[PDB]
Amino acid sequence: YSCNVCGKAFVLSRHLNRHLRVHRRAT
Numbered sequence: 001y002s003c004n005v006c007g008k009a010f011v012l013s014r015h016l017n018r019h020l021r022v023h024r025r026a027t
């Protein structure tokens with residue numbers, strides 16, 4: 001699993017989803 005927005009790889013999908021939420025921000 002990897003954050004498509006950057007390329008940061010994660011082992012767990014749940015962690016990646018949390019990381020995706022951070023990209024769903026404006027600032």
Ligand SMILES: [Zn+2]
Nearest residue numbers: 003005006008
């Ligand atoms: Zn990311």
